[PDB]
């Protein structure tokens, strides 16, 4: 019965004008969206973007494509999409995106007897996500995907999440090592520009950075170097070579840790939480060496045990205060 | 009434010659430009370029496309653009640019009954921006986008900013961490080449680098190392191991800071402000060690307290002078 199906489809496309939306000049065409999230491959702080792979499905009725006498849904080769009207959907905050092309264009067209068109695409998109790194790496980010009609206003087209809160599937599949997905939300609104009002759908995720890596890699070495710096205060004040060596070397160790670290992050003009911590730790170890200079300055140069004894208590206590204030402010 | 609209549009394009501009052989076609700045994604000192995303709209009248008996503006599928004349607009200082293509070519065509064509594109461009880094990182840059007709002279085409000072929107949207947009300006002029005079529109931005990151990351460590170097002058002159160790280690710390730093910047042949500062700080810490050599040279080897006492005052005072001159010259 392949000649009959071929005839029916040929008839559908005979005189079909791709230039005109369904119901041109009439009420807007309602387009239902449905996303299946395959993956979020990457999240980049330095590039302020993320990479998403998804199955993007669009659902609308085109009465020009209605067919009778066939009680099936016709799955057609993806090349038929070039002979049909499709919505002019784009991702307003995308940086670079493509439809996968192996072994064929990852595209689907399914027609229904009533003229419903189910148009599916498999898309990888790099999309902008401005991040607030003031609390980094104890930060929570809101990365969105903004879906809009490019040229058709709300007079001509309308979007909705098909299935409401179930329109987006596969959020459980997202496996980012550095983030957990706390929540996702679906929004619908109209956005006004100089050229008119346009339909908008917004998918957003709340990403929460896992602290564990940073505690061990950046925070703990810093804490141990700062504590190490305090050993000087228990060393004899006559051991000038030993105590000056300890002060300098710890300072220089703190510089090597800092500079190495800075190859991992974007060139932001503001203070991250980690920058504030490392700057605090640097100041502590610097003051520990300066403490010896004061002891050195008056013992030989002009109580000495008293100044050391105060340092033995005041430095760890101040570091405890510093940590308390820091971790309360940021956690 | 879709057959009537289809007929009208078919009639418009019947015998339409894309090769000939509107009013060929007559007065120039006036093309109004209008930009909506979506984002400035990146600014690169090393590549001397920036990346802009915008909605680029062109506005002109083509009397060949005038239609009667339809009191609507026709929004057409973007593929109709291939059957129309459009201006041969290009970005003279662009390095790499593309029209976004997902899910369709991010392109709009809107016709008006009087033959006005509204042609919109969503473009991402990497565009050249020669930067003067003599004051880096206290610098102000002028990055431009130069818009020109490729092949049509001012005999054949003319550009204007449609809306004057409102032709460019979305400057408030630009969120570059490392820069603030101080100002934008719109210019119109004619540019003469060997092949004739061409219309030009220029959009420029004044970018001001935020100092905050650099004070903390590069300036403050340098200041603290230089101050640290001075501790030597308060140490006993008999503590040869201690004082020589302090001098060298600080020098070596200053080298590690310098070399790490240099992976962030372009290979410019001139002195940035930060290069001048780091070179000054290196000289200070180097002179502090050489100061000890002089003390060392005459105490043992051949007043000693006098030379140290002068160093205790002259070095911090000279560094204060150095900083005063530096920060006045550059701020």
């Amino acid at each position: 019965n392949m000649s009959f199906v071929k005839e029916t489809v040929d008839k559908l496309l005979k005189g079909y004008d791709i230039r005109l939306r369904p119901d041109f000049g009439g009420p807007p065409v309602c387009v239902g969206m449905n996303i299946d999230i395959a993956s979020i491959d990457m999240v980049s702080e330095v590039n302020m973007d993320y990479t998403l792979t998804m199955y993007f499905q669009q659902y609308w009725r085109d009465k020009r494509l209605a067919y009778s006498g066939i009680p099936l849904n016709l799955t057609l080769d993806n090349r038929v999409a070039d002979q049909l009207w499709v919505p002019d959907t784009y991702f307003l905050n995308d940086k670079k995106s493509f439809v996968h092309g192996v072994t064929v264009k990852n595209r689907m067209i399914r027609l229904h007897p009533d003229g419903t068109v189910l148009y599916g695409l498999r898309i990888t998109t790099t999309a902008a996500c401005m991040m607030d790194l003031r609390r980094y790496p104890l930060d929570e980010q809101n990365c969105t995907l903004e879906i809009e009609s490019y040229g058709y206003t709300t007079d001509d087209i309308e979007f909705y999440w098909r299935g409401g809160d179930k329109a987006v599937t596969g959020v459980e599949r997202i496996e980012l090592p550095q983030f957990s997905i706390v929540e996702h939300r679906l929004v619908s609104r109209n956005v006004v520009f100089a050229t008119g009002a346009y339909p908008r759908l917004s998918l957003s995720f709340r990403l929460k950075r896992n602290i564990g890596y940073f505690i061990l890699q950046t925070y703990m070495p810093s804490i141990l170097i700062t504590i190490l710096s305090w050993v000087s205060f228990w060393i004899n004040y006559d051991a000038s070579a030993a105590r000056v060596a300890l002060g300098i070397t710890t300072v220089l160790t703190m510089t090597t840790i800092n500079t190495h670290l800075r190859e991992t992050l974007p060139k932001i003009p503001y203070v991250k939480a980690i920058d504030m911590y490392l700057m605090g730790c640097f100041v502590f170890v610097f003051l520990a060496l300066l403490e010896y200079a004061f002891v050195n300055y008056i013992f030989f140069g002009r109580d000495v045990n008293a100044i050391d004894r105060w340092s033995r208590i005041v430095f760890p206590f101040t570091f405890s205060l510093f940590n308390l204030v820091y971790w309360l402010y940021y956690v | 009434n879709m057959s009537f609209v289809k007929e009208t549009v078919d009639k418009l394009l019947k015998g339409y010659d894309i090769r000939l501009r509107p009013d060929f052989g007559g007065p120039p076609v006036c093309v109004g430009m209008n930009i909506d700045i979506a984002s400035i994604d990146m600014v690169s000192e090393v590549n001397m370029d920036y990346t802009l995303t915008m909605y680029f709209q062109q506005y002109w009248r083509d009397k060949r496309l005038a239609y009667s008996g339809i009191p609507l503006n026709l929004t057409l599928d973007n593929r109709v653009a291939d059957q129309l004349w459009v201006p041969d607009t290009y970005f003279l200082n662009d390095k790499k640019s593309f029209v976004h293509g997902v899910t369709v070519k991010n392109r709009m065509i809107r016709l008006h009954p009087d033959g006005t064509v509204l042609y919109g594109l969503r473009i991402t461009t990497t565009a050249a921006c020669m930067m003067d880094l003599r004051r880096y990182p206290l610098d102000e840059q002028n990055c431009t986008l130069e818009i020109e007709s490729y092949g049509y002279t001012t005999d054949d085409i003319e550009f204007y900013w449609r809306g004057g000072d409102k032709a460019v929107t979305g400057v408030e949207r630009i969120e570059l961490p490392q820069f603030s947009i101080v100002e934008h300006r719109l210019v119109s002029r004619n540019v003469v080449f060997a092949t004739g005079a061409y219309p030009r529109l220029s959009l420029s931005f004044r970018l001001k680098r935020n100092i905050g990151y650099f004070i903390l990351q590069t300036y403050m460590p340098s200041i603290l190392i230089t101050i640290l170097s001075w501790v030597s002058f308060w140490i006993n002159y008999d503590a040869s191991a201690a004082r020589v160790a302090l001098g060298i280690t600080t020098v070596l710390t200053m080298t590690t800071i310098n070399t790490h730093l240099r992976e962030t910047l372009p290979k410019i042949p001139y002195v940035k402000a930060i290069d001048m500062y780091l070179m000054g700080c290196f000289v200070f810490v180097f002179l502090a060690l050489l100061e000890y050599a002089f003390v060392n040279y005459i105490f043992f080897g051949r007043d000693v307290n006098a030379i140290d006492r002068w160093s205790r005052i002259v070095f911090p005072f000279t560094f204060s002078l150095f900083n005063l001159v530096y920060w006045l010259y550059y701020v």
Partner: nanobody
Framework: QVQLVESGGGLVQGSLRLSCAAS????????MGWFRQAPGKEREFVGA????????SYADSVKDRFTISRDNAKNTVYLEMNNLKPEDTAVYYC??????????????????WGQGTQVTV
């Protein structure tokens, strides 16, 4: 989730300083707009400021008359209403705009509306 409290609506004929104090997720809503509602008339754009950068724009009526700026420390925006006129007699409202929420001028693009200081002159 943004909360906006506005204050400093006095009476003049003169220079005035409206203030607009924000709290909550202000990062997601980088733009603050000033509107004003005269009795009867539609809500009308006055000006807008980006939190980050202070990129400013004004309606013609208030161009070179009013001046907006901010301080990110307090999360506060101010409309410095200099050279006042009897046309400038309205309920001035503050509002927050999302990053991708459209044109500055259109009040339907804005989500979180301040109370609205009445100002008469």
């Amino acid at each position: 989730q943004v909360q906006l409290v506005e204050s400093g609506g006095g009476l003049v004929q003169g220079s005035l300083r409206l203030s607009c104090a924000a709290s909550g997720h202000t990062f997601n809503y980088p733009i603050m707009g000033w509107f004003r509602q005269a009795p009867g008339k539609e809500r009308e754009f006055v000006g807008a400021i980006s939190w980050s950068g202070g990129s400013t724009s004004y309606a013609d009526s208030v161009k070179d008359r009013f001046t907006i700026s901010r301080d990110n420390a307090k999360n506060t925006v101010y409309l410095e209403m200099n050279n006042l006129k009897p046309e400038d007699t309205a309920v001035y409202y503050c509002a927050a705009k999302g990053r991708y929420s459209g044109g500055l001028y259109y009040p339907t693009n804005y989500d979180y509306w301040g109370q609205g200081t009445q100002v008469t002159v």
